[PDB]
Amino acid sequence: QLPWVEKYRPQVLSDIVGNKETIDRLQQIAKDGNMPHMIISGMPGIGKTTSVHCLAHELLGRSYADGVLELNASDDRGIDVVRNQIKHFAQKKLHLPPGKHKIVILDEADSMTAGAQQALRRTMELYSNSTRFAFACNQSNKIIEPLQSRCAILRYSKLSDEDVLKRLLQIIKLEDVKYTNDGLEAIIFTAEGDMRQAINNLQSTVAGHGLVNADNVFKIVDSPHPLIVKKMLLASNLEDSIQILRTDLWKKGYSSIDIVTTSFRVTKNLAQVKESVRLEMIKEIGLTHMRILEGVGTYLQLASMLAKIHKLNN
Amino acid sequence: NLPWVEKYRPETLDEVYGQNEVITTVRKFVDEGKLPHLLFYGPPGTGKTSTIVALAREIYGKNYSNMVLELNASDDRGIDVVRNQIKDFASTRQIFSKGFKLIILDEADAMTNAAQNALRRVIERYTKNTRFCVLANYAHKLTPALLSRCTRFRFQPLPQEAIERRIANVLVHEKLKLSPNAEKALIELSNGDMRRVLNVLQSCKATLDNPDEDEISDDVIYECCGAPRPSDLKAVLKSILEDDWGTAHYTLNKVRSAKGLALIDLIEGIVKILEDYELQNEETRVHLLTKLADIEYSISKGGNDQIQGSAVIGAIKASFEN
Amino acid sequence: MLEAKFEEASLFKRIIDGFKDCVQLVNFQCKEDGIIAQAVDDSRVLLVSLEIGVEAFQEYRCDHPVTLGMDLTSLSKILRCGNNTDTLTLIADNTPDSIILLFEDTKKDRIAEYSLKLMDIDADFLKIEELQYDSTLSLPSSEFSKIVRDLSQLSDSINIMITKETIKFVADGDIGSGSVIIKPFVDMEHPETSIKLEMDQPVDLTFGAKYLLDIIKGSSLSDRVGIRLSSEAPALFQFDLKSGFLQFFLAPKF
Amino acid sequence: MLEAKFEEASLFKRIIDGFKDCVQLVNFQCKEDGIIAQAVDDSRVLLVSLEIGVEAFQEYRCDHPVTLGMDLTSLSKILRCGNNTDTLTLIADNTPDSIILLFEDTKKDRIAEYSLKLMDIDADFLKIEELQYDSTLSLPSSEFSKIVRDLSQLSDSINIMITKETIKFVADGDIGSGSVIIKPFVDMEHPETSIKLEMDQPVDLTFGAKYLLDIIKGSSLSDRVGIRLSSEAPALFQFDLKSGFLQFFLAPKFN
Numbered sequence A: 001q002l003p004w005v006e007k008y009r010p011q012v013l014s015d016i017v018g019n020k021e022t023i024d025r026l027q028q029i030a031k032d033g034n035m036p037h038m039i040i041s042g043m044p045g046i047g048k049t050t051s052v053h054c055l056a057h058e059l060l061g062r063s064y065a066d067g068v069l070e071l072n073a074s075d076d077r078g079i080d081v082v083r084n085q086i087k088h089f090a091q092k093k094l095h096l097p098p099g100k101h102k103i104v105i106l107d108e109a110d111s112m113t114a115g116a117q118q119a120l121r122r123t124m125e126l127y128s129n130s131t132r133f134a135f136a137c138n139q140s141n142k143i144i145e146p147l148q149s150r151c152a153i154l155r156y157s158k159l160s161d162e163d164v165l166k167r168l169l170q171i172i173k174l175e176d177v178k179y180t181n182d183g184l185e186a187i188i189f190t191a192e193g194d195m196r197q198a199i200n201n202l203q204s205t206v207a208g209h210g211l212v213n214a215d216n217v218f219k220i221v222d223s224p225h226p227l228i229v230k231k232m233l234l235a236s237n238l239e240d241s242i243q244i245l246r247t248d249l250w251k252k253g254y255s256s257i258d259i260v261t262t263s264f265r266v267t268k269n270l271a272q273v274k275e276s277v278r279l280e281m282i283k284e285i286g287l288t289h290m291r292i293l294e295g296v297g298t299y300l301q302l303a304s305m306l307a308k309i310h311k312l313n314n
Numbered sequence B: 001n002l003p004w005v006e007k008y009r010p011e012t013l014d015e016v017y018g019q020n021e022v023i024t025t026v027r028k029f030v031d032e033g034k035l036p037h038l039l040f041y042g043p044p045g046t047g048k049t050s051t052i053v054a055l056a057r058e059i060y061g062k063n064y065s066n067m068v069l070e071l072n073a074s075d076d077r078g079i080d081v082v083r084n085q086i087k088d089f090a091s092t093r094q095i096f097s098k099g100f101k102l103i104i105l106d107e108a109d110a111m112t113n114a115a116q117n118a119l120r121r122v123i124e125r126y127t128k129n130t131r132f133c134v135l136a137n138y139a140h141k142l143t144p145a146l147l148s149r150c151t152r153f154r155f156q157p158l159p160q161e162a163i164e165r166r167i168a169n170v171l172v173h174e175k176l177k178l179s180p181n182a183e184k185a186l187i188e189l190s191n192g193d194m195r196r197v198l199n200v201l202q203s204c205k206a207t208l209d210n211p212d213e214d215e216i217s218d219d220v221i222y223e224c225c226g227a228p229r230p231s232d233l234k235a236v237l238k239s240i241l242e243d244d245w246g247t248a249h250y251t252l253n254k255v256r257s258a259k260g261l262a263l264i265d266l267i268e269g270i271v272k273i274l275e276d277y278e279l280q281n282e283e284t285r286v287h288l289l290t291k292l293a294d295i296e297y298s299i300s301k302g303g304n305d306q307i308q309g310s311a312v313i314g315a316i317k318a319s320f321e322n
Numbered sequence C: 001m002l003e004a005k006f007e008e009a010s011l012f013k014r015i016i017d018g019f020k021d022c023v024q025l026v027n028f029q030c031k032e033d034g035i036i037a038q039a040v041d042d043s044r045v046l047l048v049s050l051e052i053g054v055e056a057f058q059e060y061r062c063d064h065p066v067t068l069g070m071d072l073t074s075l076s077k078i079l080r081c082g083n084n085t086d087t088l089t090l091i092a093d094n095t096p097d098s099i100i101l102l103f104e105d106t107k108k109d110r111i112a113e114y115s116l117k118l119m120d121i122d123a124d125f126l127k128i129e130e131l132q133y134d135s136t137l138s139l140p141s142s143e144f145s146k147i148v149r150d151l152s153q154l155s156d157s158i159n160i161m162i163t164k165e166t167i168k169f170v171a172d173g174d175i176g177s178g179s180v181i182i183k184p185f186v187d188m189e190h191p192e193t194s195i196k197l198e199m200d201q202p203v204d205l206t207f208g209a210k211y212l213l214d215i216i217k218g219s220s221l222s223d224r225v226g227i228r229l230s231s232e233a234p235a236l237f238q239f240d241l242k243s244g245f246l247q248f249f250l251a252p253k254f
Numbered sequence D: 001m002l003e004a005k006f007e008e009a010s011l012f013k014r015i016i017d018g019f020k021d022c023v024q025l026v027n028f029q030c031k032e033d034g035i036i037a038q039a040v041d042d043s044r045v046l047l048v049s050l051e052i053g054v055e056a057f058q059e060y061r062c063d064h065p066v067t068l069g070m071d072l073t074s075l076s077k078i079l080r081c082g083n084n085t086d087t088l089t090l091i092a093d094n095t096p097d098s099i100i101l102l103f104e105d106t107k108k109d110r111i112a113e114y115s116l117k118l119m120d121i122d123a124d125f126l127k128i129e130e131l132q133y134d135s136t137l138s139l140p141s142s143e144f145s146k147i148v149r150d151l152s153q154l155s156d157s158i159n160i161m162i163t164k165e166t167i168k169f170v171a172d173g174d175i176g177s178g179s180v181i182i183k184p185f186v187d188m189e190h191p192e193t194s195i196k197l198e199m200d201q202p203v204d205l206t207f208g209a210k211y212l213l214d215i216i217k218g219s220s221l222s223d224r225v226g227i228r229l230s231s232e233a234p235a236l237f238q239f240d241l242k243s244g245f246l247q248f249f250l251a252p253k254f255n
Ligand SMILES: Nc1ncnc2c1ncn2[C@@H]1O[C@H](COP(=O)(O)OP(=O)(O)OP(O)(O)=S)[C@@H](O)[C@H]1O
Pocket: A005, A006, A008, A009, A010, A015, A016, A017, A018, A043, A044, A045, A046, A047, A048, A049, A050, A051, A137, A138, A167, A195, A196, B145
């Protein structure tokens, strides 16, 4: 077998779907070649690493194997590496087209020690005539302030719904899969922006149950069913909600964190109730979540959360 | 000589209970030979470790001491450990090995985000020469990438039939008699963790083995577990809902003192009892749940015990006024 | 019950020095055919095997197969105290728990007795299956050692390839690339500097640097080394000896 | 581009090992006249110049002048491989991104070609003008190396004095002090034991111990080392070669 996320990974910059502004920025960068040092920040699985990889590929053409140094969390990045190997790579003579430059792609820059990030400063400041640096990070706060200021910051928003839907439809058309609209909406729901997780859940559903259907997705996700949680959060009499939470969710060994997270996610999408009541229900569920994370996970906390949600809905 | 928790540990796939839905799947995976990376996650005392060790011993037989590497949580777990040990074990190919190795990471939910990123990159790199198996209690503290990379397996708690079968097998292989209500109270208090059951059994064994023939009554089980008896809960709730303030306060104090009761478990039992009453109005239930959750949250930080007890009494009383 | 006497002392010295670094604890099994040993490194990549017959010795007697599991570091510490003109003698008696070494030269009364404890492991695992190797070659030990410890500084993955009568060692890393090319030739005046090559199929595979560096340290035994390469099978590096051999089985990489 | 064929591969090995400890990055300006190189110390205190004419090359063909800027640790790692009785060959292509070093055995077909990745260095090439040095002397290299290795074991500075046809080395540390004097003389029996001296002004200079210890490593190239001292200008140490020279420019200390 073969993972779809690995098989259908975009190799050309145009195939990347998502942020429309920064992808066009990188398109013009590859068209010109004068790429500056850049940090790329954003939430996981929204197309950070693939973006910089495609950029380097399209920018260097046939010389990618000789003019690119990649360093992820697997490779050793301490003090000796940044002082010896990176410095000897930056000085390496290489005759490229007039606009191109050697590229150093540092993925998961957050794991790089601050003391290790110190050494990179003069190494990237001095040899900026034949070497450019591209950091890829989740949180741009763990990068030291000097490196934070030396390079251009590129933020990647979380994926919307129409973009993930378009990508999934492309994948289905290329793979000739049987599906339905409710299944795709369930994929969008369980993904919430993670293109990688969306594609993986799609492939797992197709491999396990063949047909992309709501019950199949909700049986392969191992998460509480969104319909039953919505019924819990929308029952008229409180005892019905308490009985639902007791018998249908608490007995089957679900983790309280998962229950609160699913309630949060379904309350976000309840497009039938008003907006203010949604915000207040989210506030209550979030207070209950903060209580849960502090060490107490008794059923009484979820019962009180449901009670307060009903008190608000009345 | 060794404790029952270590003695009665299963050694084959047949000696696991209440997990048939996953046992058939792992048997399909071992007969097919296409065993991918696995994620076993669930509440403690369920059999994840036992199941994976039995599966490894079945697949590799005597080569288990060579092609199976077990690693635990925070073994000087910097990025350096994932860079050296796991990476060497994955990359290095044995002299006379056919197939793939197995690296089992026990309680591997205590890894930092950087450590989990290193692990996901490693499992992505050498996914053709070895397969991994990650064990977890809470599947919400893992990076979604590592979760998506492998196949999930949730370990639902042990049902009543499985625990009853296991305690029967333990009983017939030991010199103990067990009263009818004893196993009922046991299953009610254990909540489905086999480890706690095998611990409390040998505990009450060593506790009441005076003539080698005493019967384990519910008193000794409630003592060794340190949990109240439902009769005391009903009595204290009755005293609170019926008597006045001073007598109810004295009753709560004596019940929580002479037996050693924590307000947390007492409140758990009291709300469990109140869950099945035929309350005519609704505001009573709402106020009760809210105030009791607030009391529990305040107890979680260790205030003044008598004040929280009086607050419990006041909430229970002022809730039942309609 | 076991008496094994040599002709010289440096023989066993270099025999131990050959694989002194690869493993630490090793079991020597003695029978009427001589002495056999087989061990594996902790990484389980290199398999060392050593067989010495009953001809390099001068007097060898034993009743039944005996096993002695001992540490090589302490054995070398003890063995390094002898002159090159002396004569070593292994002595063992009933219920063997302490081995006795005896250095003694007839020109002067120096009875050097050394007792050494036995740390047993009870892990033999000797299993040799394949006997058909796709390609074989034989070349002086000094040349091979020079080539491997010359190409070891460039990278950590040495690529051996047996093409049509063109033996090629390649290495590529960060500071550059190295390529040694040697063709077979026979010298009638000196067969000890000849290159023998028999190829059934063109071979190409890789090996680790440190493993080759640990293998070549057994170059003091013989002046000629034999390499046997085969796909889907471990490579075999053999060093002959007047009454046996020392062979390293190495597992390739991907 | 360029094809250079050494007669003995040990020559370039000794050349590189002579000054591989004072400069980490050197530039080799390959012209038609030969190979010229100059490199400054990482502390900008000790300059190293090297000239090797076409007479030292069995065959030397350069299409057009070029600059090969390579490291010395990697070049020493590579040059450490080949044997003595080989025929080293340096080859470079147009727009050289890497240099090729062939090692060929005269009586064998064992050809070993290595590749080295060239570095990029800003050509901070300063031009050196000949100055009339006050004191000019020459002495056996072994004698000078012994004197430096003996005096440096006391302090971190060595004082040189040239006065009335007399050479003097002085050191004063905390553990004691030491002094040596040399008188010029010559012997027809062996001219490799003569200490020449041509003084125009009595001069007094002081140099660092570590830099002298790094310089004296050049004693393996030649046997007669020449020294040119001036009142305030940097001292010039010269080791002659069958087709060229290796020169260390050393900067004096302050009073
Ligand atoms: N916009 C996108 N279009 C198509 N595929 C995408 C997109 N974004 C993510 N993917 C997929 O997500 C997979 C995961 O790779 P990346 O997105 O590069 O991971 P990441 O963004 O670096 O997040 P990390 O590594 O956890 S910080 C890729 O192999 C793609 O198949």
